[PDB]
Design a protein around this ligand. Sequence first.
Ligand code: HEM
Ligand code: HEM
Lengths: 87, 87
Amino acid sequence: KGRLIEVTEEELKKHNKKDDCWICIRGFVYNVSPYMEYHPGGEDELMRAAGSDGTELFDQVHRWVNYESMLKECLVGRMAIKPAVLK
Amino acid sequence: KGRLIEVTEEELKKHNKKDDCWICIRGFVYNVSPYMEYHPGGEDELMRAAGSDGTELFDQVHRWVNYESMLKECLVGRMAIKPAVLK
Ligand code: HEM
Ligand code: HEM
């Protein structure tokens, strides 16, 4: 139970510390704390997106990196949507 | 004295509550708590950037709003930089 969740922005922003770092990329939310020590660009760079939507930063440095496959085991879930999104 | 300070990432993240809400826009840090009740987009929207760098969110909704003049009385200071930034 509880493998994949809906993530509100309020929830996402709680996870803004190195040891508890969530980032949203294209609506998918990942727990990148276990990846911190491996990121080729270093920890400080990854932390620029801590607790936030990292899509723009990600796209400005390496748009084609296969994050979905690399981070699959760290997938938290998906960002919540406003009902109007579905109009 | 003490009107403008250097703001670290650690310090910025502490000011994440509605009554003590700091937002960084383009390196400038503002305590927006007094502005909460006036923001045309409402309080929830402004809270999306609480205790964080709000530049991307700000630019996604109203790039041209004159925040420097509007929020001048709320200016905390500037984000810290690493020495390497000055190379
Ligand atoms: C969202 C904030 C991120 C920032 C600011 C960032 C920044 C960087 C930077 C500066 C580099 C070195 C690029 C260069 O010197 O050309 C890099 C490399 C790399 N990063 Fe990130 N990164 C972010 C997120 C991620 C994430 C989430 C992943 C993994 C899913 C990732 C995987 C990689 C990979 C695979 C490389 C090496 C690409 C190559 O071999 O050329 N990055 N990153
Ligand atoms: C922190 C400094 C900010 C200032 C000084 C500011 C100022 C303003 C102003 C002047 C408007 C009305 C613009 C108009 O007349 O067309 C507005 C609306 C709005 N604001 Fe902000 N804002 C700030 C931050 C933010 C942030 C960070 C967000 C998003 C997280 C946001 C979300 C919105 C939204 C959604 C609207 C209504 C936009 C629309 O319906 O087109 N604001 N704000």
